[PDB]
Amino acid sequence: SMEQVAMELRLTELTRLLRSVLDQLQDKDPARIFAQPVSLKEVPDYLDHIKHPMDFATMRKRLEAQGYKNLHEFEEDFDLIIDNCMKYNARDTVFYRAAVRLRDQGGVVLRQARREVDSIG
């Protein structure tokens, strides 16, 4: 139907906007600490601690399949990246500290993303 096509176009357009958001957030991780999944070869107990792992590569896979239906779903995955890191790692670590800085810098980008998503519909 035409209604289904129009809904598909809206999802494609959201996908384009989320890809720009993802690129902007990932620039706030210049050390690439969050670029890839925590390796279970290297951190074999990770899944005993963290029940829903997340990372930027995994979000990019989901995004390119158009698997984010709305900005809430995308933000949920970004907050998992931060929140997982701040539980597994202590305050005095480069990991924890990178997550704080990504959270603080990302909030700015996400504040305007929410306005754009709402504005454009």
Swiss-Prot record:
Residues 9-113 form the Bromo domain. It is found in: Nucleus; Chromosome. There is a cross-link at residue 41 (Glycyl lysine isopeptide (Lys-Gly) (interchain with G-Cter in SUMO2)). Highly expressed in testis. It comes from the Eukaryota. Component of some HBO1 complex composed of KAT7/HBO1, MEAF6, ING4 and BRD1/BRPF2. Component of the MOZ/MORF complex composed at least of ING5, KAT6A, KAT6B, MEAF6 and one of BRPF1, BRD1/BRPF2 and BRPF3. Interacts (via PHD-type zinc finger domain) with unmodified histone H3. Interacts (via PWWP domain) with dimethylated and trimethylated 'Lys-79' on histone H3. Scaffold subunit of various histone acetyltransferase (HAT) complexes, such as the MOZ/MORF and HBO1 complexes, that acts as a regulator of hematopoiesis. Plays a key role in HBO1 complex by directing KAT7/HBO1 specificity towards histone H3 'Lys-14' acetylation (H3K14ac), thereby promoting erythroid differentiation. This is Bromodomain-containing protein 1. The chain holds residues 555 to 674 of 1058 of the full protein.
